[PDB]
Design an enzyme around this catalytic site. Structure first.
Site, short mmCIF file in Angstrom:
data_model
loop_
_atom_site.label_atom_id
_atom_site.label_comp_id
_atom_site.label_asym_id
_atom_site.label_seq_id
_atom_site.Cartn_x
_atom_site.Cartn_y
_atom_site.Cartn_z
N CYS A 12 0.89 -1.15 0.00
CA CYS A 12 0.00 0.00 0.00
C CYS A 12 0.94 1.21 0.00
O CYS A 12 2.16 1.04 0.08
CB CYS A 12 -0.87 0.00 1.25
SG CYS A 12 0.11 0.01 2.76
N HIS A 41 4.77 -4.97 9.53
CA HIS A 41 4.67 -6.32 10.08
C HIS A 41 4.88 -7.43 9.06
O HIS A 41 3.97 -8.18 8.73
CB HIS A 41 3.34 -6.48 10.81
CG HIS A 41 3.22 -5.61 12.02
ND1 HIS A 41 2.00 -5.21 12.53
CD2 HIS A 41 4.16 -5.07 12.83
CE1 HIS A 41 2.20 -4.47 13.61
NE2 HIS A 41 3.51 -4.37 13.81
N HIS A 74 3.02 2.13 11.86
CA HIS A 74 1.83 1.99 12.69
C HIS A 74 1.55 3.18 13.59
O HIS A 74 0.45 3.31 14.12
CB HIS A 74 1.93 0.71 13.52
CG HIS A 74 2.48 -0.45 12.76
ND1 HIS A 74 3.84 -0.66 12.61
CD2 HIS A 74 1.87 -1.42 12.04
CE1 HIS A 74 4.03 -1.70 11.82
NE2 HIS A 74 2.85 -2.18 11.46
N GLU A 126 -0.75 0.02 16.54
CA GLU A 126 -1.50 1.18 16.06
C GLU A 126 -2.49 1.63 17.12
O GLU A 126 -2.72 2.83 17.31
CB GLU A 126 -2.24 0.87 14.76
CG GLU A 126 -3.07 2.06 14.28
CD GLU A 126 -3.95 1.75 13.09
OE1 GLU A 126 -5.01 2.39 12.96
OE2 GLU A 126 -3.60 0.87 12.28
N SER A 225 0.58 -9.37 11.37
CA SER A 225 0.02 -8.36 10.47
C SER A 225 -1.50 -8.39 10.58
O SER A 225 -2.15 -9.35 10.17
CB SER A 225 0.43 -8.62 9.02
OG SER A 225 -0.26 -7.74 8.13
N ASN A 227 -3.91 -6.47 9.04
CA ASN A 227 -4.61 -6.49 7.76
C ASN A 227 -4.47 -7.82 7.02
O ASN A 227 -5.40 -8.25 6.34
CB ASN A 227 -4.16 -5.31 6.87
CG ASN A 227 -2.85 -5.57 6.15
OD1 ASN A 227 -2.82 -6.16 5.06
ND2 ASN A 227 -1.76 -5.13 6.75
N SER A 269 1.75 -5.30 3.77
CA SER A 269 3.17 -5.25 4.10
C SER A 269 4.03 -6.31 3.43
O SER A 269 5.24 -6.38 3.67
CB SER A 269 3.34 -5.33 5.62
OG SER A 269 2.57 -6.41 6.14
C1 LIG Z 1 1.15 0.38 9.13
C2 LIG Z 1 -0.19 -0.31 8.98
C3 LIG Z 1 -1.27 0.23 9.90
O1 LIG Z 1 -2.00 1.25 9.16
C4 LIG Z 1 -0.49 -1.32 8.11
C5 LIG Z 1 0.42 -2.00 7.10
O2 LIG Z 1 0.55 -3.43 7.35
P1 LIG Z 1 1.30 -4.06 8.64
O3 LIG Z 1 2.65 -3.48 8.55
O4 LIG Z 1 1.24 -5.63 8.49
O5 LIG Z 1 0.53 -3.42 9.91
P2 LIG Z 1 -0.89 -3.97 10.47
O6 LIG Z 1 -0.63 -5.19 11.32
O7 LIG Z 1 -1.39 -2.88 11.49
O8 LIG Z 1 -1.93 -4.37 9.36
S1 SF4 Z 2 -2.60 -0.26 5.47
FE1 SF4 Z 2 -1.83 1.22 7.12
S2 SF4 Z 2 0.15 1.92 5.97
FE2 SF4 Z 2 -1.10 1.00 4.43
S3 SF4 Z 2 -2.19 2.61 3.46
FE3 SF4 Z 2 -3.62 1.78 5.07
S4 SF4 Z 2 -3.18 3.14 6.84
FE4 SF4 Z 2 -1.48 3.46 5.45
#
Ligand SMILES: CC(CO)CCOP(=O)(O)OP(=O)(O)O
Ligand code: SF4
Ligand SMILES: CC(CO)CCOP(=O)(O)OP(=O)(O)O
Ligand code: SF4
Lengths: 310, 309
Positions: A12, A41, A74, A126, A225, A227, A269
């Site tokens: 993303c 993550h 985060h 977060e 992670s 998401n 991620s």
């Molecule tokens: C930085 C974020 C939170 O917005 C999301 C991106 O993916 P991850 O690095 O896996 O973080 P999360 O476990 O919060 O989904």
């Molecule tokens: S998943 Fe977390 S890092 Fe990625 S775009 Fe959404 S808010 Fe931003």
């Protein structure tokens, strides 16, 4: 065996930015570069950055004076931010702008002494950071994870209430929580819908379309992670066998034996190369050419700070 | 005379994307490329695109069949969009994502037959496009430009009411309008604040800081640029002489004669070269090195669709 690829999937805007912030800091200033908690993550990304000189720490107090420190995507609490500011350190904030947006609203509520409710999962970084934007005793900051939590929540002044959400939640489940919040607190105020970001919404939408065709769904992502777990859960709840995996090596022959259609996606991620390797593994397991499904085009990009341009 | 530059200023993510869309379409398909309305409200940009072969029109009728059509960054109504789809035209949409976001909310209220109120300026293309996302006769779509407009508005069912705003409005004025809406319709629903975009908010904040230092403020932007006008307006309300100009040639000596501090900024649709030229003129008028004021770092970027990259 037909291999289908979800679209969108993977990186993303926030994650791409965060990783580049660390990579460029290392490229420009050299090792070591200190990072508070995993930048994103994903074990592959974290292992790669560590191999290049990045040092992941737990507390700022572990970082030496004169060093360069990076906050994870985060986000961090105000206490963490202020501590780093008072220190003799060069700080780069890789917090995603979409997380920062929620932070500002929480700080606003704390400023007015009005209570706020965050919909999220306890313990997640977060959530720690967002809850950490509230510091007014006269008000209050509460965390709810489900309708049941809302049903048992007690507030001082429900006449002045607002809510926020974690950015990576299940779209469907969060809807349930919001519905409960509005029935319990009819004057509660919030955004038009929630704070779930475009990337989370899109990836869940994409996996939904993927699960409709695939018998098995592989979600590239790490156990921590948020998401990524939501992507795997959505597929499972649709009745398909879903697996959250870190890389191709985690794939067990048993999983896809006799499977006619296998779908693959990746959390926000997870680097695309991991997906490419998963595809390669499935092919030697009988899979053919990977077929990308039609999907909503994403066009958002978040640039790294000018100082770290490379 | 000291020259100060506001920060941020100039090009926003939506404008940069939109201009690239037209440029790329011209390189890919060649001239002519039809564009519904000035892609962005800047004479310099529009004049230049006409050069390369872009043809700007207001109605789809003006566009021949088999042609390529691009919708401007301001957005278009569903009626326009459908009229374009009913025709044998290849369409590319340069509407800024931040405008599209508002559109989607209006369409939702329309589908539910629930009334919506838009805060904006009548006649502006973005307002026509956003209002144009509502089509349910059961409900309603109303435009208000001030608190007074709110004071005289009556709706069918204020129990199911929502509001949206133009993306380039005065932050302060919009606040007044929303306050009126909430006192008039206590159950009205909307975003946490408004739909004014980051670029508009940032440029207004920046011109406010610039004006507290400069005696005169020059805003680079065209007459029909809504966001640009708001920048000059803000400085003027602060008691400083402010002028909206297209380029260095519009600068009249009297504006900066004996002025110790002149400030310069630019609307979201004005190219940086125009600012450079303005600074050059101010320097031949006695000004020294241009000093950039400290400001909010912007990092958002919107990519052109893959079909045009
Ligand atoms: C930085 C974020 C939170 O917005 C999301 C991106 O993916 P991850 O690095 O896996 O973080 P999360 O476990 O919060 O989904
Ligand atoms: S998943 Fe977390 S890092 Fe990625 S775009 Fe959404 S808010 Fe931003
Ligand atoms: C396309 C928009 C509206 O979001 C803004 C960019 O600047 P302009 O091209 O000058 O348009 P506007 O007059 O609406 O400010
Ligand atoms: S001014 Fe705001 S909404 Fe309008 S094009 Fe620029 S960034 Fe998009």
């Amino acid at each position: 065996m037909q291999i289908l690829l979800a679209n969108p999937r993977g990186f993303c805007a926030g994650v791409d930015r965060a990783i580049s912030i660390v990579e460029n800091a290392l490229a420009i200033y050299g090792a070591p570069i200190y990072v508070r908690h995993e930048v994103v993550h994903n074990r592959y990304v974290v292992d790669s950055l560590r191999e290049r000189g990045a040092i992941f720490i737990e507390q700022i107090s572990e970082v030496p004076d004169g060093a360069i420190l990076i906050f994870s995507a985060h986000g961090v609490s105000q206490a963490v931010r202020n501590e780093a500011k008072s220190r003799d350190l060069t700080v780069f904030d890789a917090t995603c702008p979409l997380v920062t947006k929620v932070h500002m609203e929480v700080a606003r509520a704390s400023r007015r002494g009005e209570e706020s409710i965050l919909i999220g999962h306890a313990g997640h970084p977060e959530v720690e950071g967002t809850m950490g934007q509230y510091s007014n005793p006269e008000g209050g900051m509460y965390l709810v994870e489900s309708p049941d939590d809302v049903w048992k929540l007690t507030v001082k002044n429900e006449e002045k209430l607002s809510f926020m959400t974690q950015t990576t939640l299940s779209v469907d489940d969060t809807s349930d929580v919001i519905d409960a919040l509005r029935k319990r607190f009819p004057k509660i105020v919030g955004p038009r819908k929630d704070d779930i970001c475009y990337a989370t919404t899109n990836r869940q939408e994409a996996v939904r379309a993927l699960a409709e065709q695939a018998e098995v769904v592989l979600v590239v992502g790490s156990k921590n992670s948020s998401n990524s777990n939501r992507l795997a859960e959505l597929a499972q709840r649709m009745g398909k066998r879903a697996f959250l995996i870190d890389d191709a090596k985690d794939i067990q022959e048993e999983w896809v034996k006799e499977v006619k259609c296998v779908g693959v996606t990746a959390g926000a991620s997870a680097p695309d190369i991991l997906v490419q390797n998963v595809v390669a593994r499935l092919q030697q397991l009988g899979g053919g050419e990977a077929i990308p499904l039609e999907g909503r085009e994403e066009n958002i990009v978040f640039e790294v700070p000018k100082e770290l341009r490379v």
